[PDB]
Amino acid sequence: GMSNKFLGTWKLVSSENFDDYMKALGVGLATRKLGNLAKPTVIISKSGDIITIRTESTFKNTEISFKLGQEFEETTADNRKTKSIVTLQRGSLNQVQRWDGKETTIKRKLVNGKMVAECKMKGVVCTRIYEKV
Ligand SMILES: CCCCCCCCCCCCCCCC(=O)O
Numbered sequence: 342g343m344s345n346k347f348l349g350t351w352k353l354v355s356s357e358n359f360d361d362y363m364k365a366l367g368v369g370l371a372t373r374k375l376g377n378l379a380k381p382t383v384i385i386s387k388s389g390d391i392i393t394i395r396t397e398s399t400f401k402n403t404e405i406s407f408k409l410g411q412e413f414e415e416t417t418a419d420n421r422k423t424k425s426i427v428t429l430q431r432g433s434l435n436q437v438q439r440w441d442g443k444e445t446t447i448k449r450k451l452v453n454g455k456m457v458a459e460c461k462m463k464g465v466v467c468t469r470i471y472e473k474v
């Protein structure tokens with residue numbers, strides 16, 4: 342199952358290439374200007390087979406709850422209405438989002454007590470690092 346080590350409250354400590362990633366997502370300038378300044382808190386909890394990922398920033402909050410491998414409807418921070426699925430591959434929590442024939446991936450894994458989120462969209466690769474708070 343998903344590592345309990347994922348469970349808890351995390352906070353952004355580093356972001357590489359987030360602007361280009363958002364740009365690839367078609368994000369608007371207003372949301373980009375703020376997304377580049379934002380240092381979100383990610384809270385991850387799990388109950389039975391139900392997992393929740395909550396994102397909090399002074400600018401925008403998001404929350405998704407899901408079961409591994411079961412596609413669900415998601416509304417992203419940038420107001421994308423996507424069909425999403427989260428899977429587990431070698432202890433890496435992998436989210437795929439599909440919309441308008443397009444596709445993006447967010448892979449979250451633990452690295453020396455840190456959580457690393459790699460965001461991919463059309464050759465643009467973003468790395469956001471979180472610390473456990
Ligand atoms: C609410 C935090 C997101 C920052 C605001 C910018 C909106 C862009 C949304 C694109 C998806 C970003 C998800 C980041 C992945 C992660 O770090 O967990």
Ligand SMILES: [Cl-]
Nearest residue numbers: 379380398399
């Ligand atoms: Cl913030």
